[PDB]
Amino acid sequence: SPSRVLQAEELHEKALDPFLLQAEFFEIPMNFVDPKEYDIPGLVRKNRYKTILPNPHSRVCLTSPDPDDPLSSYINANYIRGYGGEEKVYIATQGPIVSTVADFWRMVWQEHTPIIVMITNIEEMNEKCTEYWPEEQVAYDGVEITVQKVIHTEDYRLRLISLKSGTEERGLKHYWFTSWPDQKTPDRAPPLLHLVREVEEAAQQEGPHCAPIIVHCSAGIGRTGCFIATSICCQQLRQEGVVDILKTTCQLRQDRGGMIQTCEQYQFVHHVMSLYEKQLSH
């Protein structure tokens, strides 16, 4: 796997060299999936983008309501390895569309997902994501979703949610980040880093072997990949005192084609990690 281990000084300088960054970035294979892989009638209606498909080896398959129906069992989502290759730390998925809102909640229930991270600005709720949570309460497929509390913070809005299906009840935290920048300049890094830290602590609070954290945006690759890469690299920096964004990005691409879609995104991850290193070093 490609690797570029950055110590502090090289990290700071690397984040500020857009020519080297793009040279490096555009040699990472996208690892997109051949559409022939999901040539099933009606399956196209379940995808936002025809070219952005879940790699089959890591695809999340839905086991209800009909596991013998390839359409019913399909969602555009992949399991994503975390730091050190830990399996199923995240699920990367597309923002639900009207026809997949119920599927999304089926995934949440099936995977026991305790945390969702939504990276969509309020302005983008017309294009990039269908509002899939209730004002108070809604049910899809025997799982009742109840919003118990909304907590507005500067860098995100956190919904505390209860999921009930049958006799059993589970908690869920929905983190909605609304500060995704147009220009991915270093001044815009702190809120993303803060989100990353908040979510990683929430995850530790779930105890051993936390169920997959769902992360989405519109396609489930760009901003989603930035968030996951940053999360992984924060653990790497703390443990190893270095970051290897190149290796991490390559690992993510193995799990889901296109993770970190643009060079601006790739650079932004470097800005965030440079920021975090500075914070740690002081």
From Swiss-Prot:
Keywords: Endoplasmic reticulum, Hydrolase, Membrane, Phosphoprotein, Protein phosphatase, Transmembrane, Transmembrane helix. One of its GO terms (molecular function) is protein tyrosine phosphatase activity. It is found in: Endoplasmic reticulum membrane. The keyword Transmembrane helix applies. The keyword Phosphoprotein applies. Substrate binds at residues 182, 217-223, 261. One of its GO terms (cellular component) is nucleoplasm. Residues 21-276 form the Tyrosine-protein phosphatase domain. Its main location: endoplasmic reticulum. The active site is at residue 217. GO terms for biological process: protein dephosphorylation; signal transduction. It comes from the Eukaryota. May regulate the activity of several effector molecules involved in synaptic plasticity and neuronal cell survival, including MAPKs, Src family kinases and NMDA receptors. Belongs to the protein-tyrosine phosphatase family. Non-receptor class subfamily. This is Tyrosine-protein phosphatase non-receptor type 5. It comes from Homo sapiens (Human).
